[PDB]
Design a protein around this motif. Structure first.
Motif, mmCIF file in Angstrom:
data_model
loop_
_atom_site.group_PDB
_atom_site.id
_atom_site.type_symbol
_atom_site.label_atom_id
_atom_site.label_comp_id
_atom_site.label_asym_id
_atom_site.label_seq_id
_atom_site.Cartn_x
_atom_site.Cartn_y
_atom_site.Cartn_z
ATOM 1 N N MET A 109 0.854 -1.185 0.000
ATOM 2 C CA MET A 109 0.000 0.000 0.000
ATOM 3 C C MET A 109 0.881 1.223 0.000
ATOM 4 N N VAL A 110 0.635 2.231 -0.815
ATOM 5 C CA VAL A 110 1.349 3.480 -0.753
ATOM 6 C C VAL A 110 0.295 4.548 -0.482
ATOM 7 N N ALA A 111 0.596 5.459 0.424
ATOM 8 C CA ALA A 111 -0.327 6.520 0.818
ATOM 9 C C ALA A 111 0.398 7.851 0.848
ATOM 10 N N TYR A 112 -0.286 8.948 0.531
ATOM 11 C CA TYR A 112 0.295 10.291 0.630
ATOM 12 C C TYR A 112 -0.340 10.890 1.864
ATOM 13 N N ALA A 113 0.390 11.330 2.870
ATOM 14 C CA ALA A 113 -0.190 11.867 4.108
ATOM 15 C C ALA A 113 0.086 13.373 4.044
ATOM 16 N N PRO A 114 -0.892 14.271 3.999
ATOM 17 C CA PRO A 114 -0.627 15.696 3.810
ATOM 18 C C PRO A 114 -0.180 16.353 5.123
ATOM 19 N N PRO A 115 0.496 17.479 5.174
ATOM 20 C CA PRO A 115 1.010 18.081 6.403
ATOM 21 C C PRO A 115 -0.121 18.531 7.309
ATOM 22 N N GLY A 116 0.149 18.673 8.597
ATOM 23 C CA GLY A 116 -0.922 19.087 9.493
ATOM 24 C C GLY A 116 -1.310 18.026 10.500
ATOM 25 N N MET A 117 -0.882 16.770 10.435
ATOM 26 C CA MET A 117 -1.188 15.718 11.363
ATOM 27 C C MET A 117 0.012 14.793 11.319
ATOM 28 N N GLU A 118 0.303 13.983 12.310
ATOM 29 C CA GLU A 118 1.444 13.101 12.204
ATOM 30 C C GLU A 118 1.128 12.059 11.193
ATOM 31 N N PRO A 119 2.112 11.540 10.436
ATOM 32 C CA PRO A 119 1.901 10.528 9.411
ATOM 33 C C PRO A 119 1.330 9.249 10.018
ATOM 34 N N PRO A 120 0.508 8.495 9.288
ATOM 35 C CA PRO A 120 -0.118 7.325 9.846
ATOM 36 C C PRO A 120 0.905 6.259 10.169
ATOM 37 N N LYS A 121 0.730 5.477 11.216
ATOM 38 C CA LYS A 121 1.670 4.413 11.492
ATOM 39 C C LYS A 121 1.125 3.053 11.092
ATOM 40 N N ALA A 150 14.140 23.464 -1.727
ATOM 41 C CA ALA A 150 14.998 23.275 -0.561
ATOM 42 C C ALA A 150 14.198 23.253 0.720
ATOM 43 N N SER A 151 14.849 22.814 1.787
ATOM 44 C CA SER A 151 14.208 22.702 3.065
ATOM 45 C C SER A 151 14.911 23.685 3.980
ATOM 46 N N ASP A 152 14.143 24.556 4.618
ATOM 47 C CA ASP A 152 14.702 25.549 5.488
ATOM 48 C C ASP A 152 15.027 24.895 6.820
ATOM 49 N N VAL A 153 16.120 25.345 7.418
ATOM 50 C CA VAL A 153 16.592 24.873 8.698
ATOM 51 C C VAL A 153 15.549 25.172 9.802
ATOM 52 N N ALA A 154 14.692 26.173 9.624
ATOM 53 C CA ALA A 154 13.614 26.404 10.566
ATOM 54 C C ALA A 154 12.516 25.340 10.469
ATOM 55 N N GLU A 155 12.346 24.670 9.352
ATOM 56 C CA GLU A 155 11.202 23.830 9.149
ATOM 57 C C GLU A 155 11.485 22.450 9.758
ATOM 58 N N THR A 156 11.072 22.262 11.021
ATOM 59 C CA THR A 156 11.208 20.953 11.704
ATOM 60 C C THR A 156 10.279 19.838 11.191
ATOM 61 N N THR A 157 8.979 20.117 11.021
ATOM 62 C CA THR A 157 8.062 19.205 10.340
ATOM 63 C C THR A 157 8.112 19.414 8.827
ATOM 64 N N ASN A 158 8.134 18.347 8.004
ATOM 65 C CA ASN A 158 8.074 18.579 6.574
ATOM 66 C C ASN A 158 6.711 19.162 6.147
ATOM 67 N N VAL A 159 6.954 20.314 5.553
ATOM 68 C CA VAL A 159 5.990 21.214 4.993
ATOM 69 C C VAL A 159 5.114 20.547 3.945
ATOM 70 N N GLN A 160 5.600 19.603 3.109
ATOM 71 C CA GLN A 160 4.716 18.981 2.154
ATOM 72 C C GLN A 160 4.293 17.566 2.522
ATOM 73 N N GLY A 161 4.270 17.104 3.797
ATOM 74 C CA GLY A 161 3.704 15.785 4.042
ATOM 75 C C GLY A 161 4.665 14.646 3.846
ATOM 76 N N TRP A 162 4.133 13.435 3.834
ATOM 77 C CA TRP A 162 4.942 12.222 3.848
ATOM 78 C C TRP A 162 4.467 11.218 2.838
ATOM 79 N N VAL A 163 5.398 10.407 2.337
ATOM 80 C CA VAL A 163 4.864 9.269 1.647
ATOM 81 C C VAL A 163 5.141 8.062 2.575
ATOM 82 N N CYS A 164 4.130 7.187 2.619
ATOM 83 C CA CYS A 164 4.050 6.072 3.498
ATOM 84 C C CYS A 164 3.843 4.816 2.712
ATOM 85 N N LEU A 165 4.793 3.909 2.766
ATOM 86 C CA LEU A 165 4.755 2.645 2.101
ATOM 87 C C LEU A 165 4.630 1.562 3.169
ATOM 88 N N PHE A 166 3.614 0.741 2.975
ATOM 89 C CA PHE A 166 3.300 -0.301 3.916
ATOM 90 C C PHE A 166 3.274 -1.625 3.238
#
Lengths: 186, 220, 46, 220, 46, 220, 46
Positions: D122-134, D171-187
């Motif tokens: 399964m591949v899922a795109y998790a958008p920013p704003g919530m922790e990525p699904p586990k 690029a990713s700014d050193v201030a940006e601790t959470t990734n601004v564009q979300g996660w890809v999740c492969l299960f």
């Protein structure tokens, strides 16, 4: 005329109500494009300057009037007095890029460098005020940045400006009944 | 041979206002689309006509309250965009960036008293050259309008541009002790039980109001 | 169109001199100011 | 008389990017013919779409192997062209020379196990704003696709561009601790005897992927 | 055609400004990228 | 390449008289209307022809009075725009800003005596090269006109331009002891009881009077 | 029209080079000088 004042539909009476005659007006000096389109001085940082229009002081004509809008769009010209060569880098560049000369670098030519730059933000318009933290404005709200060994003067000039949603424009509050000033006289 | 040219003295310095453009250095950038955004304005006087803003009366309040005493002057002030009474309006905030104007300025008056409070008011324009009238009766000889309260709470009146010259100054010179453009005089003719009720007043640009000759003069 | 006044044409293409706008799919205060009521509301006499 | 000209201040210095050309000094040279050479490319994104390159997983390997334990996360990483997992792809090598992008990035998954090893992924795109699904189950609420092994070894999925603004930063700014564009999740949903088999994954540019605003920032 | 943006024509002939190409007798990656399969391959349902 | 140009030596300095204009810096200003204002003049010689101004005679008076004695010369002076007699006329005030002129100058004579005072006068132009005539009789050989008093009080006479060259100087050189352009000679032939009456005289530009070659020379 | 003598056209628009005049609704000394009487007034003889 009387009208319902609670409503907010504009009412514009004229001197014809008591027998006068409305004259013709020519309003090109209050056209937004026209009036924003002139240079304004900002105090520069010595070397890195990020190009941000909110640096122009709010009492100036361009600062007063930019803050009278909440969203705006424009391209930009800058005129810079600097030592060394001047590099500009677009919105989103790593700060280290300001040291690489393939980014638009203008070689020193006395007495100053005048440059035309595009709008470069990732947003369809920028804003003078943003209610995210409530003072701070998102870091993507800028026109890039410049750097030179020393920059001495920096002037901004808005090109093709558009303004949306007007906001308060305040005059000096007089202490006496009229704000009096020495006006240029022979 | 090549084309001969005279590089002319006295031309070529940067002017902060000039009518020409810089040379470009970073081509081909296409913007995010922004067609149809709400709320655009093109001319600062469209918003000065469509949005009246409040006058400021003694005490820092946008209204005048009905008096119950023999003095019928509710307010009297210089017809000047640098007047204290005008100093918080958008029209005055605009006018400080220009040196001359002409045309109509409209005043709006809105009664705020309860349904059983009634009043009749008079607004007069007193032109320069004589002291402003102190009574409704002396003021009747001026251009003036009188109205009373009823189902409609608002009344709007155009202050006329009247001057020897075709434009006037938006600033007030420190030499000018008497206001050069006259006074507006607001009176209460009488009221029936309106004691303490507020008449709030706003100002907006008229149809032919015009500001010309942009100037930046510190000020905010 | 702002404060510009040369009669001859720019030496650079428009695509270099300015950013280019794209479309998807005095506007409001002009319409607002034009719609203002300028009448009377009573019956007028004389 | 001759033609008068204003040599203008502020114009004329060399700009490393300007839109004009130098004066020539050595004319008339004709080149060897080179029409029809194989392998030309005109736009760096034609090769970024046509040639997928490998992702990098822990250990420095381009694949993930099926796990046989209760943890079903095969990989989870920042949807960022500056992600470590993307750092050896051609797409990331290209993206470092631009400041903004938008559009689709495609992920390719190829099963490498023997004919008697089977799995479902399964591949899922998790958008920013919530922790990525586990877990596959929490992740089912995201945009996602699931597939299994069979005669065709490869599956390709488009990660959608979803953002408040129309472009994002490469690029990713050193201030940006959470990734601004979300996660890809492969299960891994399950497998039948696929223990130890590798799923190799590649990435390529989608049809509307776009890079704009060239920048040079040291980097290699 | 690269990064060039003057509207007026070059003062020098083309034969001085650039080398001239000769013929004998995005080409490949463009054709390659256009030929990419963008379908499905199953039977689709719903 | 770019367009090559020769910046030429000897061209380009500011000249206080040059035929070119400065670059503008403050656009779009519309003036108050002024079409139809009364009293416009376009050419200084239209007013020099239409408005005669007074000559100045000994004593600082604009007239000459009839004499009753054997001397019949009423006035004799240099036909020079730098003559003392001409020094308060508008024509002389104009002429000081040019170096050359030619064409006609008109003299006007107006009798101011009572109805029972009569006289007959003569004006003659004496060209350079001989001493000016001292009597009506020697002067009769010059171009001259004679007239008497009656219902019309004024007589006007054109002094002719006569010179070897086509233009003459409006200033008088310190070397030139004799006036280069001759004399005008006004005589009284007789009078009947006009003792003490004044003939006032004015001068104006004739139809073909012309001033050329503007010069600024301190002077006022 | 005063002291100006370039044959080619100004680079700036007229609206920037000069103020613009507006209308409401050698004029007098020229008319005056043209109306001057240049005759005689007697009867002339010879």
């Amino acid at each position: 005329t009387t009208s319902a004042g609670e409503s907010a539909d504009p009412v514009t009476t004229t001197v014809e109500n008591y027998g006068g005659e409305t004259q013709i007006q020519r309003r090109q000096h209050t056209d937004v494009s026209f009036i924003m389109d002139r240079f304004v001085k900002v105090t520069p940082q010595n070397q890195i300057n990020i190009l941000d229009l909110m640096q122009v002081p709010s009492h100036t004509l361009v600062g007063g009037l930019l803050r009278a809008s909440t969203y705006y769009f424009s391209d930009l010209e800058i005129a810079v007095k600097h030592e060394g060569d001047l590099t500009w880098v677009p919105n989103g560049a790593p700060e280290k890029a300001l040291d690489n000369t393939t980014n638009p670098t203008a070689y020193h030519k006395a007495p100053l460098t005048r440059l035309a730059l595009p709008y470069t933000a990732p947003h369809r318009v920028l804003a003078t005020v943003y209610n995210g933290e409530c003072r701070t404005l998102p870091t993507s709200f800028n026109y890039g940045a410049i750097k030179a060994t020393r920059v001495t003067e920096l002037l901004y000039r808005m090109k093709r400006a558009e303004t949306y949603c007007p906001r308060p424009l305040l005059a000096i509050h007089p202490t006496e009944a009229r704000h009096k000033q020495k006006i240029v006289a022979p | 041979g090549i084309f001969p040219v005279a590089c002319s003295d006295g031309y070529g310095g940067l002017v902060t206002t000039d009518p020409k453009t810089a040379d470009p250095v970073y081509g081909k950038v296409f913007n995010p689309p922004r067609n149809q955004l709400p709320g655009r304005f093109t001319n600062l006087l469209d918003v000065a006509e469509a949005c009246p803003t409040f006058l400021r009366f003694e005490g820092g309040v946008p209204y005048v309250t009905t008096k119950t005493d023999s003095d019928r002057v509710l307010a009297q002030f210089d017809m000047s965009l640098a007047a204290k009474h005008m100093s918080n309006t958008f029209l005055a905030g605009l006018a400080q960036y220009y040196t001359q104007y002409s045309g109509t300025i409209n005043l709006h008056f809105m009664f705020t008293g309860p349904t059983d409070a009634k009043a009749r008011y008079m607004v007069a324009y007193a032109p320069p050259g004589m002291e402003p009238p102190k009574t409704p009766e002396a003021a009747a000889h001026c251009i003036h309008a009188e109205w009373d309260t009823g189902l409609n709470s608002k009344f709007t009146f155009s202050i006329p541009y009247l001057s020897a010259a075709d434009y006037t100054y938006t600033a007030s010179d420190v030499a000018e002790t008497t206001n050069v453009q006259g006074w507006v005089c607001l009176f209460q003719i009488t009221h029936g039980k309106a004691d303490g009720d507020a008449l709030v007043v706003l100002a907006s640009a008229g149809k032919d109001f015009e500001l010309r000759l942009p100037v930046d003069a510190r000020a905010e | 169109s702002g404060n510009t006044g040369s009669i001859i044409n720019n030496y650079y293409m428009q695509q270099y001199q300015n950013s280019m706008d794209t479309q998807l799919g005095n506007d409001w205060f002009s319409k607002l100011a034009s719609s203002a009521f300028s009448g009377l509301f009573g019956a007028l006499l004389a």
